[PDB]
């Protein structure tokens with residue numbers, strides 16, 4: 001579908017994702033400019049095709065799903081850039097708190113929407129959060145992890161980041177709930193505020209032990225069942241829990257409260273997206289225009 005004579009002409013390479021390359025492309029027939037993901041499996045085609053109806057203003061629009069000549073292509077709307085580039089462009093000054101708050105509010109709306117339709121993402125990270133120039137932010141790639149799994153390395157052998165991965169996934173839980181996305185978004189909220197990743201693990205055990213060093217080694221008091229998880233070891237070091245006050249300065253008390261609730265160990269206790277939207281942190285939310 002992408003080429004000189006095809007439905008889509010390539011304009012430039014945008015990025016490389018977990019499953020394939022993403023090009024900015026133009027569609028010869030409609031004039032439309034799109035982002036076209038090329039991935040190089042029937043159950044997955046049925047599942048991904050159902051995502052075309054999961055439309056919301058904070059979800060990157062899925063225009064089409066094409067299966068042809070042993071490739072799967074996803075055609076998405078095109079936006080400005082991803083949040084990882086925006087954070088980097090923003091590094092000397094940081095993203096202003098009111099824009100962090102508007103982005104978090106909008107991301108919680110997109111999660112609330114997908115979760116109400118029983119679709120989870122399970123691999124949220126700044127690279128799949130896309131912004132436009134007007135102040136909106138949207139989530140890309142919902143539902144693709146359920147379709148394909150999350151591999152250790154990408155198609156180009158790149159390491160798939162662990163930094164946003166919830167502790168129940170690292171501890172080898174068999175069942176993932178929508179809570180896994182609230183954990184990832186809490187980690188991304190902290191990184192916007194502090195301008196550094198919260199838990200930049202470089203292996204599964206470094207990621208777990210970074211989480212325990214900040215939030216305390218979990219036990220049965222705070223997380224019933226934790227000592228029976230598959231990958232839990234009684235020999236894990238017992239670290240004391242840090243104050244949030246140290247973790248995400250200069251976030252205000254309402255922001256720390258909300259973040260603490262997005263980072264509860266027990267996925268059952270973790271705040272839901274719908275409840276997060278009602279949190280007092282958002283009482284004064286606005287929609288600022290980003291400085292690009």
Ligand SMILES: *CCC(=O)N1CCCc2cc(C(=O)OC)ccc21
Pocket residue numbers: 014015017022035036037060074075076077078079080081082127128130140141
């Ligand atoms: C269908 C395209 C896609 O899967 N994604 C995943 C993340 C990369 C990306 C980038 C854009 C974009 O607008 O860059 C500005 C849109 C969609 C996606």
